[PDB]
Design a binder for this molecule. Structure first.
Ligand SMILES: OC[C@H]1O[C@@H](O)[C@H](O)[C@@H](O)[C@@H]1O
Length: 313
């Protein structure tokens, strides 16, 4: 059979959720799969694995580039070798990759900022925590958030980059609350940030006093949402990113690139035709959590939190 390789950005449970989609699609379509993440943000590790996949003669590659520019030459080389390439989770739109499969990161951040604006009444101080200052998804989320709060009196008083290191996400957030005792809110951009901010807020006895709006729906985040430490999180569909990345690359092998692209959503921004699978976003709050868990279970998306139903056939 064919082999399809997938490269993500860090060891976080988020990437395990992606990997479970990769595995599921591998079984469903009968294709071997390979998955790699470095421990934290590490463009050279990604680049090295990319080169390995090409040298192994894989039939397709999906990559979540920590730096959109740095990966362009190696993606070009894969394409020259006849290896189709797609991105997932975060993009490199000038690379030659055929499809981006992931969240509308700009719109998700914009939604987060509208939520923050309402939560704070259009006023107060926010600290941002993120794990990249180069990955487009982070840049887009932060820009969306800023654009959405622009008209209000809200001020961003720090943007802190942990480079996808959870210990560092914790220490930076802790330092921020100590530096800013009048902090009104944290915004968490990557999966590490919400729960790190939640831990710090809870440790400081500021639950509900310092609001948290964040990203993702890993079990640690969901538990803080349940407890009311996190008021809202922008849930992605990592399982679907992994699953549909394998599916697209599989099709590009079986029916070809052109035929596959004709099946997908086509977009055209600034006159440039491109192909994008929006895996969607779910705003998750304490008030809609049970409904969220219901939604994911019925969508067939595994969530290792809360109750589960089994139908006996
Ligand atoms: O930090 C863990 C992960 O957080 C997610 O929110 C992002 O989409 C990923 O790009 C990142 O690697």
């Amino acid at each position: 059979m064919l082999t399809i390789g997938v490269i993500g950005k860090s060891v976080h449970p988020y990437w395990s959720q992606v990997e479970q989609g990769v595995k599921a699609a591998g079984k469903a379509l009968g294709v071997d799969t390979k998955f790699f993440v470095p421990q934290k943000e590490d463009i050279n590790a990604q680049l090295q694995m990319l080169e390995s996949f090409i040298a192994e003669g894989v039939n397709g590659i999906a990559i979540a580039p920590s730096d959109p520019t740095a990966v362009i030459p190696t993606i070009k080389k894969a394409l020259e070798m006849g290896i189709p390439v797609v991105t997932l989770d975060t993009d490199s739109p000038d690379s030659g990759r055929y499809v981006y499969i992931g969240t509308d990161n700009y719109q998700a951040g914009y939604t987060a900022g509208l939520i923050m604006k309402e939560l704070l009444g259009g006023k107060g101080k926010v600290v941002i925590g993120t794990g990249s200052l180069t990955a487009m998804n982070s840049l887009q989320r932060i820009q969306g958030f800023k654009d959405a709060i622009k008209d209000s009196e809200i001020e961003i008083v720090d943007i802190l980059n942990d480079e996808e290191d959870g210990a560092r996400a914790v220490s930076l957030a802790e330092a921020a609350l100590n530096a800013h005792p009048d902090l009104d809110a944290f915004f968490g951009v990557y999966a590490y940030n919400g729960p790190a901010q939640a831990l710090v807020v809870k440790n400081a006895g500021k639950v509900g006093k310092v609001k948290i709006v964040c990203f993702d729906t890993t079990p640690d985040i969901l538990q803080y949402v349940k407890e009311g430490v996190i008021q809202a999180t922008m849930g992605q569909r990592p399982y679907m990113m992994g699953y549909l990345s394998v599916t697209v690359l599989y099709l590009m092998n079986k029916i070809g690139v052109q035929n596959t692209l004709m099946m997908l959503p086509k977009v055209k921004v600034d006159g440039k035709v491109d192909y994008v699978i929006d895996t969607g976003v779910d705003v998750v709050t304490p008030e809609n959590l049970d409904e969220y868990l219901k939604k994911m279970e019925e969508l067939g998306i595994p969530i290792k939190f809360g109750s589960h139903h089994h139908h006996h056939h």
